């Protein structure tokens, strides 16, 4: 009944587990949508598909053409699929809005702590067997000051966690919650978030307003050697910026979950570690992804 | 006069040394100390019989084992190290294996940002298993706290081993080792514990049926090993979730500095712990 | 005409040998499979590689979609049902061989690696690791070097290992001329296997070469002996070369695939060789 | 009496000994010379006088500043393999059930023209190898050398070579007129892609002129042999392939070292 495209293992996986529920007829592709690929959905009521799958309008008539009813999405984020053109076609379109906060903060922290210990490279020693300890010399967080930016629900995962280290806890976010409160974050502004914290974090969306939020006048501000983690999106750290930094030495360590060759440069010379949006990642995470884009399947055949 | 010195070493102890103010000669070589009131050793240079007017010898680590023990010779040691640190390692190779993190660099490096085969499981929901209620264990335990995961231990709640086998998607241990330790961890617990179970130990390596793990990582029984080391490695890493770290648990600037204060105020003594 | 299991090379060839052809280019980055078939409508041809389906309903299918040519941009057509395809009058057409000296040159290339350990070097040098512990090797000059297969492959592998300065012993059944005025002695593989201090495998999947290499042939073969292999992987019994392995009767292994060091069926990759594919693939195509 | 030993120097040297029948894994420095209370040492270990002094009072390379010609020659074009086809690539994919061969594509060595600089034993090694592959020689030297000539070699222009050849290996030794003899002024004469080695004296290369011209395209591939971050920038995001000083790195070469330092 639904036919699934840009499928990646993962996908195959949970979406059957979950379907088992749900009871559908599921036809993976795994390769990309397309007008000339729109094809392959004949005889399917629903398509599902991820972020770089194209929804331009073209495809969508396409869509139709083959009796397509429903859209779903894999992920929140639906700026492929062109929306207007959508309605005019009487295509419904269906998201998943939010993934578990728990998920997101937890591969944030095992950047960080990946990143602080240097176990990426240990791998890479250890795995032929070179256990030389030289340049993985870490620190140790308990002593020390952890900076958090936003209080959503995964900033505040965060918060718990970090609270788990015996670190002591400031927040950048402009509204406090009680939830992070009951914690004992103390709120404070960025410049003293900067300055005081030796690990950041930021987990917050993207507005006009703080694009390039972390930016090199902010760098200047902050600790040397400090420890900086990016899950959230790209924009608000400001990469330049970021790389005279790390360059020059007032960043020890940077990890970046990339939404969809500097990366070679940047992970070889430092302590960069890169990972393709990976946050999600987790079967717990995938599983509801599923149940959340499947039921929406369901609703459409009775609102 | 210190031996087996790496550049860490070297850091801290000159660091930590501005307080004291002791003349330091350092050797990048095993266990010559002419003009050395007192020596400091690691964990492989050797103190045995056979081993120039030094005083005293002192000891970077807990461990005694390589020295014996007449001679108008006074020996001290460290007998702790940051609970903290290496609480903090043990959790950060779990994340590292639960999140596949070290494989992603492996492809990140150079721009591959495939995901397939790095998927976790998320902690919050978790059961967790911490064995030895040390300061390590409790420091290990608070931060699985942080986690979100529901606490059982054996030296909170507190539960005999199988009881935490069976319950514990998670385990660690962080106890010395003991006649009664010895291979703890053996086919009879493998074969208890959940399918997929990720097991993490900074502590002594026979703890764990090194031929009996594998057969159960062979057998499924394993999800991810994590291991801090005092071709098997290249094999068992390579086909496996298996991390192999060189002991490392409490490489940190403020462990180290805190060894070497340790051990710096004992050659400074007074009396003091050998 | 429209490609499938398009990868970028097999993309960028193919259009720079276009310019010559003229020919209408549609790439498709996914396997052909029935389902895919459909993809094809309005193309009068189709290239494919090893993996695609060329069994018989893809086949219908892409009839149905007035298909008049499957191109194969590789020898061997083991994917494609050709009866059926006759039946449905659809022309099926092939490359019938790779630039032999590039394959040939990487079976050396291959072997130096494994023997000069440049692979692991590599790995501690990104690093700014330059200990060279573990990394030594042997010089070939001198050395005693075995061919299987004399084909056009095993040929010009074995004037690369001549300039090496080389002992040369191969095993064909049927020798070549080429190959003898190399002054190259053909033996019967024992001799060879005993002999050779170097083995390199040149020879296609017929059912005698079958696990050519098997623990028999590994229990003569010198104590550290390498191996290459970028024939089929048949050739070779992966068990006993496992057991060869850790009972280190093999210095080295090296294979060609889809201390040992693995490649992905790459053999030919090199632009020389893709070019010709194209060429010759598109000009299957002219006729 | 051994310094600076590494695995590789201790077996040999026993197995070479035991017709002459004659270990320290650490530095030789002053500090170091009571152990000796007839050495032997690498480049790398210290040969200050206040060493030899201390030394009064209780090398196994060419270099003094403190081998087979097959060998190098053998390792210079294993070097130039690996780089063409990207196997060091490969294995990283590989080892780790990657199969993708994206960006690993090579060029066919046979029917190419390869220039090599310089004629010493190594020169000659090595294009005798390379005869081997089919490739068309050109090579520079002052003097001809004979057996080179009997290969079929023709000596060239340094900008001819430069100009024709899409493979350049240097077999030559530092000296006023080549020191930087790969420059700016090189590089944009040579056919882009072109692959160089050097397992030769490093000098001969004009580093930063190297970089640009990688950054510029005008090199496809670099081989670099490190007598004792750009080594990561560049073998990172670069056709660049860096060894240690491996070149005589053989059981065979080293064995020959080991004799000739027991003989002496």
Same mark, same amino acid.
């Given at each position: 009944? +639904? ?45 599902? *598909? ?42 419904? !379109? ?21 990143? #602080? ?8 020693? &250890?795995?032929?067997? #070179?256990?030389?300890?030289?340049? +993985? ?11 958090? *930016?936003?209080?959503?629900? *995964? ?27 009951? +914690? ?44 900086? !983690? #990016? ?14 930094? +790390?360059?020059?030495?007032? *960043? ?22 890169? &990972? ?5 990642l987790t079967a717990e995470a995938l599983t509801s992804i599923s149940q959340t884009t499947l039921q929406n399947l369901s609703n459409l055949?009775?609102?």
């Amino acid at each position: 009944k +639904l036919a699934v495209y840009s499928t990646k293992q993962y996908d195959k996986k949970y979406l059957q587990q979950v379907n088992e529920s749900f009871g559908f007829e599921l036809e993976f592709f795994d390769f990309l949508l397309t007008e000339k690929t729109a094809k392959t959905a004949n005889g399917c009521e629903a398509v599902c *598909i991820f972020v770089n799958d194209d929804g331009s309008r073209p495809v969508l008539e396409e869509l139709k053409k083959h009796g397509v009813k429903y859209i779903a999405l894999r992920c929140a984020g639906f700026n492929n699929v062109d929306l207007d053109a959508a309605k005019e076609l009487g295509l419904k !379109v269906v998201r998943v809005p939010a993934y578990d906060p728990e998920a997101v903060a937890e591969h944030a922290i095992g950047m960080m702590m990946t990143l #602080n210990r240097r176990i990426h490279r240990a791998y890479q020693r &250890t795995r032929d067997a #070179n256990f030389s300890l030289e340049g +993985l010399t870490g620190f140790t967080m308990y002593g020390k000051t952890a900076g958090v *930016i936003g209080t959503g629900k *995964i900033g505040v995962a965060m918060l718990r966690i970090l609270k788990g280290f015996g670190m002591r806890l400031l927040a950048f976010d402009p509204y406090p919650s009680a939830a992070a409160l009951e +914690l004992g974050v103390e709120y404070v502004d960025l410049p003293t978030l900067f300055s005081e914290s030796d690990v950041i974090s930021l987990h917050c969306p993207l507005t006009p307003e703080n694009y390039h939020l972390l930016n090199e006048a902010a760098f200047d501000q902050m600790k040397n050697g400090v420890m900086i !983690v #990016n899950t959230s999106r790209g924009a608000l750290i400001d990469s330049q910026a970021a790389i005279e930094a +790390l360059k020059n030495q007032k *960043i020890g360590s940077l990890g970046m979950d990339v939404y969809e060759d500097v990366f070679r440069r940047l992970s070889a010379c430092h302590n960069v570690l890169f &990972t393709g949006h990976q946050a999600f990642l987790t079967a717990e995470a995938l599983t509801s992804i599923s149940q959340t884009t499947l039921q929406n399947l369901s609703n459409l055949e009775k609102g």
